[PDB]
């Protein structure tokens, strides 16, 4: 029982680590190629036909219209999520001076918009932060890298400032080395997807193995939303780092939780392989984190946590590689250069002349 499980897992680790190749030949990644595969695949469907004015006018309904015209940024007056627009604008505004004219339909909603099982004049292009293979949306680094992530008691202005978060968590990961971390599964979050339930219920049944509780979110409708338990307190990102085994789950789409876990130098257990952000592709299972299939069972959790508790060096090696990957390949510079490379490649697809639109408002700079 325990032995077959161990063979299976160790076999997967060895194979994933034998087959692994760095995302860039040089660790500093000067030509911003680490995440290049994802932007190529997202843009590929437009390579032969390109993007016509009509395609854009048709896609406008699916997001906020942004326009670079004459090195100036314009936008629909109405942004659905102003804080998210501000976060996006932090990255576009410094690139506008050195970018050709283009129209961008940027979806600032959680869920993507271009279902490829519809298609449909769901042809796009539309930019969204998260998607699965079911959607044509082009991924972009989320607003929250600067501003406008979910708002909590500890972060009332929205989770943001990834640059400051990186320093904070680096210092905290150094303060709590592996040996000092509690040997327990940890998760603290709201019930934005029912894939999260089995870990919470396992925690209620075996609190010495897993510490997992539901918080209350702004969409709370009834106590079913915490599986009939009193809402738990928020726990800071820094305090996640006192645990060895940190769980991550999709929410409505991908969760901004994930990136924060790696910087604790804790072992990240990532549940599900469907919902993506632009950097997920180069995070490789068994190299940087422990993958679990969707809707994990309580027994799966018990087996996998037991295995790693008994193979602590292994646990630490994956944790360290996870940490190293995010430290080196999700810098602010990586976020900035991905945006730039994305917009530079996108513009070449345009098969029309961008014209002013006077109903749009001037954003900057």
């Amino acid at each position: 029982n325990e032995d077959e499980f161990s063979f299976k897992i160790r076999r997967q680790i060895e194979k994933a680590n034998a087959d692994y190749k760095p995302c860039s030949s040089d660790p500093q990644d000067s030509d911003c190629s680490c995440h290049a595969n994802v932007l190529k695949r997202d843009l590929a469907p437009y390579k032969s036909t390109g993007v016509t004015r009509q395609m854009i006018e048709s896609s406008a309904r699916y997001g906020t219209k942004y326009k670079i015209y004459g090195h100036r940024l314009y936008r629909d007056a109405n942004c659905m999520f102003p804080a998210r627009c501000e976060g996006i604008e932090h990255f576009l505004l410094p690139l506008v001076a050195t970018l050709p004219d283009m129209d961008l339909i940027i979806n600032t909603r959680d869920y993507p918009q271009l279902n490829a099982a519809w298609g449909n004049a769901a042809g796009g292009p539309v930019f969204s932060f998260s998607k699965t293979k079911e959607y044509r949306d082009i991924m972009y680094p989320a607003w929250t890298f600067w501003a406008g992530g979910p708002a909590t008691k500890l972060h009332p202005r929205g989770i943001g400032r990834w640059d400051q978060m990186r320093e904070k968590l680096e210092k905290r990961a150094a303060a709590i080395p592996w040996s000092q971390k509690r040997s327990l599964g940890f998760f603290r979050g709201s019930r934005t997807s029912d894939e999260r339930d089995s870990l919470i219920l396992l925690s209620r049944r075996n609190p010495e193995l897993v510490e997992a509780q539901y918080t209350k979110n702004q969409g709370w409708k009834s106590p079913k939303d915490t599986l009939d338990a009193p809402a738990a307190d928020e726990v800071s990102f820094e305090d996640h780092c006192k645990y060895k085994y940190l769980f991550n789950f999709r929410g409505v789409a991908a969760s901004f939780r994930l990136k924060h876990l790696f910087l604790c130098k804790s072992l990240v257990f990532h549940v599900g392989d469907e919902w993506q952000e632009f950097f997920y592709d180069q995070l490789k299972p068994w190299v940087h984190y422990v993958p679990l299939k969707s809707y994990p069972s309580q027994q799966e959790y018990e087996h996998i946590l037991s295995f790693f508790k008994k193979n602590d060096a292994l646990a630490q090696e994956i944790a360290q590689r996870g940490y190293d990957f995010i430290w080196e390949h999700l810098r602010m510079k990586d976020i900035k250069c991905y945006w730039r490379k994305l917009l530079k490649r996108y513009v070449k697809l345009l098969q029309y002349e961008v014209k002013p639109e006077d109903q749009l408002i001037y954003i900057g700079p």
Partner: protein, 39 residues
């Protein structure tokens, strides 16, 4: 609608889901669609 799940209202605001969109209720001192602006 399920847009409030992702906590779109800042600075202590509360959220209600319509069918199309969401709406924030902002405490005294804050305003804007997301309670992002000082009153």
């Amino acid at each position: 609608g399920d847009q409030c799940e992702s906590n779109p209202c800042l600075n202590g605001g509360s959220c209600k889901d319509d069918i199309n969109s969401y709406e924030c209720w902002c405490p005294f001192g804050f305003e804007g669609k997301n309670c992002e602006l000082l009153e």
